[PDB]
Design a protein around this ligand. Structure first.
Ligand SMILES: [Mg+2]
Ligand SMILES: [Mg+2]
Ligand SMILES: [Mg+2]
Ligand SMILES: [Mg+2]
Ligand SMILES: [Mg+2]
Ligand SMILES: [Mg+2]
Ligand SMILES: [Mg+2]
Ligand SMILES: [Mg+2]
Ligand SMILES: [Mg+2]
Ligand SMILES: [Mg+2]
Ligand SMILES: [Mg+2]
Ligand SMILES: [Mg+2]
Ligand SMILES: [Mg+2]
Ligand SMILES: [Mg+2]
Ligand SMILES: [Mg+2]
Ligand SMILES: [Mg+2]
Ligand SMILES: [Mg+2]
Ligand SMILES: [Mg+2]
Ligand SMILES: [Mg+2]
Ligand SMILES: [Zn+2]
Lengths: 25, 214, 97, 127, 63
RNA sequence: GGUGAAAUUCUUGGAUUUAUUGAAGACUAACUACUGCGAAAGCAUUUGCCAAGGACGUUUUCAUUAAUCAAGAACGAAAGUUAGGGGAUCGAAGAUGAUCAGAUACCGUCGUAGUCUUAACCAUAAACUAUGCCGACUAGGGAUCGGGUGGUGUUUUUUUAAUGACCCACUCGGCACCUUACGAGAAAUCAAAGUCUUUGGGUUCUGGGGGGAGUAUGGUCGCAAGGCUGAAACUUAAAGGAAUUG
RNA sequence: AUUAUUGCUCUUCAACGAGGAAUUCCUAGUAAGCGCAAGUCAUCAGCUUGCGUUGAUUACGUCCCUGCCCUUUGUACACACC
């Protein structure tokens, strides 16, 4: 896939792990 | 089931003084009826006629004039000055590449206190022997030219209203005094007053208006 | 690799020009990369000119052309206007006709 | 010699407007367009239609009282095409050939000291 | 009705996308000293005579 | 009206077209160029004010005060964020008309945020010449921008000048192009990407097969979006560059 | 020889009144019309391969349609756009 959408893919992904991890802070 | 054509009052338009044919054209109105009339309602329109149609001579093909109607007298409605334009084609044909264009303008008053903003444009010409293919001036050049043009324009206006200014523009003396004070800075070609618009006229004064009429 | 020294087109000593809008598809394109034509043409045409003067007051009149600049966008410039696509060497040639 | 009015032709694409008015503009005299003289949407601009509208316009022109006319031809303009539509040329010829007079004709398409964002977005109208 | 005879003085070539049409320069006989270029429909060589049904109007290209 | 063609849409509410006139906000057309300026982002209407700058001129002045730079800091397109204003236009989102097998799109319509401005954030772009800076040397040509020098050059008339604009020669410093190649390179190409195995003028920075991955983790900055710093396990024989023929 | 090989004779006497959208072939002893011999073949030509007989109209051009070829150009294809 186009680099930039992949960069967008993983931005999304980090915000998700960033979320799930806060459930346990 | 009407056809306003079998109902419309008809008319003819007369130019003012300092031109050629005062006879200008024709118009349609609406019978001066009790409640809404051919008089007060309109008449006071405007007409754009190329002064070459209005002076005859063709060394005047461009340059359009606004004639506004102010007063009326039975199948005979007069007009006064309302502005001047150029033609789009002439202008579009002075703006060649490889040369500097220069414009300047000022808002300024007359005697019969019309208030107007007049325009001015000129282009750097090649020196008749010059080898380099463009010829531009030097901003410092440009700045000075506009200040002198601006100087000359503020001078020439506040003559006897548009009337004499009108009389001033038609033989284009303005265009030449410019070139004269200018040629000591930088060449230049064309050089016209291009445009002049009216934005604040005084008060009717049926007298002075009638002074261009006979 | 690199395919031109003018890169896209004509910009050395600046950094940023200013976009124009393509006359055909409205695509923004930098002014120096533009690709331009002066559309100068008579108001009338090949046929109407005789019929013009004929049904006119004035001796032959004067006649005024229309002068307007065109800004195309490469894609629009290629798809019809000035384009061909030139061989490796012909591309170098900046002469017009 | 004649009685003068104003012709004023707006010729965009997809239709061509012809309509004559009093030399002042305030009071008009007959209109009719190219969309009027054919039914097909697609064929609204074409010279064939403008000719027909030039014909109708000429008729009422010298059926009311105007013998002659100056024309002010005009494209869309503004932040649009800036170039003359097809059926303004036809209309012109087909209103001189009609048997009317012609005197001094300039272009009046609105041209800005450019601006207001053009439509169609930066990537262009793409297809 | 006026007739108007013009003798083909030169063959210029073919136009018309099909290519059936032939450009040609003719010369009138009834008062020469004036030439016009016409578009013919049939086969043509030098020195043939076209009956120009009307006399003053020439074409150029053909699509 | 709009399109390849259509339709959604607007039309006794006289639409669209015309006329005179007014308001609002944005923008700076044509002139505009292988042209200018700035550290870079960037900068194009006029005039006034405010401070700034390079180049040039220089038998002025100081006299090594300099070059390059981890840390640290100023500025930093667009979008985006906070709080006001503004909100013409265009217009992520959304809703629609069509198209299509489908069509969350391309095309058309409505149009929210936004687009502009103030005060504060943000710190990223293919932020590009994909080419660090300072210094030296090495080869030809015609244009052009700025500055200066030289001329019983041209043109402007007045009474010759003085001016100005122009022409020729030269010279600094610019933005570029042309031709060559002694020379360089994997080539494309390159007055540097040259003066390199005959390998050293000074200095800063970065890379060390491809993925995994700019991911995980810690730190830090941010209101947020996110920025900076930045791994491994494991997997893999190629990924890749330039050019040639199909 | 029935589902009738072919041939003859009388009788029966259909559609078809020049053919929509479309589409084939052709430039001179050619097109078209006309028959013949040969192949096949015990018997069966409405088919073919050739042959001669009668003998035109209209082009002698072009790139519009369609098909192909050539340059240029792009490619991450080379098992080569299946
Ligand atoms: Mg919880
Ligand atoms: Mg390659
Ligand atoms: Mg490529
Ligand atoms: Mg940039
Ligand atoms: Mg396309
Ligand atoms: Mg401007
Ligand atoms: Mg640092
Ligand atoms: Mg520290
Ligand atoms: Mg808004
Ligand atoms: Mg949507
Ligand atoms: Mg849908
Ligand atoms: Mg959606
Ligand atoms: Mg970066
Ligand atoms: Mg770049
Ligand atoms: Mg050199
Ligand atoms: Mg000198
Ligand atoms: Mg290749
Ligand atoms: Mg046989
Ligand atoms: Mg067989
Ligand atoms: Zn385009």
């Amino acid at each position: 896939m186009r680099a930039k959408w992949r960069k967008k893919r993983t931005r999304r992904l980090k915000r998700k792990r960033r979320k799930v991890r806060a459930r346990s802070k | 089931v009407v056809d306003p054509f079998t109902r419309k009052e008809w008319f003819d338009i007369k130019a003012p003084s300092t031109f050629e044919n005062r006879n200008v054209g024709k118009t349609l109105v609406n019978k001066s009826t009790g409640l809404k009339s051919a008089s007060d309602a309109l008449k006071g329109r405007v007409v754009e006629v190329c002064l070459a149609d209005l002076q005859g001579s063709e060394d005047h093909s461009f340059r359009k004039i606004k004639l506004r109607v102010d007063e009326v007298q039975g199948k005979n409605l007069l007009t006064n000055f309302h502005g001047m334009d150029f033609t789009t084609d002439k202008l579009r044909s002075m703006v060649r590449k490889w040369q500097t264009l220069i414009e300047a303008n000022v808002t300024v008053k007359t005697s019969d206190d019309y208030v107007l903003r007049i325009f001015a444009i000129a282009f750097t010409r090649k020196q008749a022997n010059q080898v380099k293919r463009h010829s531009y001036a030097q901003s410092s050049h440009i700045r000075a030219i506009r200040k002198v043009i601006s100087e000359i324009l503020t001078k020439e206006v506040q003559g006897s209203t548009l009337a004499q200014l009108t009389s001033k523009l038609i033989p284009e003396v303005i265009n030449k005094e410019i070139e004269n004070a200018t040629k000591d800075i930088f060449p230049l070609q064309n050089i016209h007053v291009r445009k002049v618009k009216l934005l604040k006229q005084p008060k009717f004064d049926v007298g002075a208006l009638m002074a261009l009429h006979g | 690799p690199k395919k031109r020294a003018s890169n896209g087109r004509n910009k050395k000593g600046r950094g940023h020009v200013k976009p124009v809008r393509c006359v055909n598809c409205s695509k923004s394109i930098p002014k120096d990369k533009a690709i331009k034509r002066m559309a100068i043409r008579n108001i009338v045409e090949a046929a109407a000119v005789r019929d013009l003067s004929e049904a006119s007051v004035y001796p032959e009149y004067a006649l005024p052309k229309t002068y307007n600049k065109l800004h195309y966008c490469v894609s629009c410039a290629i798809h019809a206007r000035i384009v061909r696509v030139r061989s490796r060497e012909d591309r170098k040639n900046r002469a017009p006709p | 010699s004649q009685v003068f009015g104003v012709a004023r032709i707006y010729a965009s694409f997809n239709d061509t407007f012809v309509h004559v008015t009093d030399l002042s503009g305030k009071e008009t005299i007959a209109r009719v367009t190219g969309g009027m003289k054919v039914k097909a949407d697609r064929d609204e601009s074409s010279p064939y239609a403008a000719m027909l509208a030039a014909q109708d316009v000429a008729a009422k022109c010298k059926e009311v009282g105007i013998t002659a006319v100056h024309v002010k031809i005009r494209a869309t303009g503004g932040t649009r095409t800036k170039t003359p539509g097809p059926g303004g040329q036809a209309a012109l010829r087909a209103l001189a050939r009609s048997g009317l007079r012609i005197g001094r004709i300039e272009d009046v398409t609105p041209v800005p000291s450019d601006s207001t964002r053009k439509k169609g977005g930066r990537r262009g109208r793409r297809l | 009705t006026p007739v108007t005879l013009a003798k083909v003085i030169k063959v210029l070539g073919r136009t018309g996308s099909r290519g059936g049409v032939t450009q040609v320069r003719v010369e009138f006989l009834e008062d020469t000293s004036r030439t016009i270029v016409r578009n013919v429909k049939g086969p043509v060589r030098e020195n043939d005579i076209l009956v120009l049904m009307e006399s003053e109007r020439e074409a150029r290209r053909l699509r």
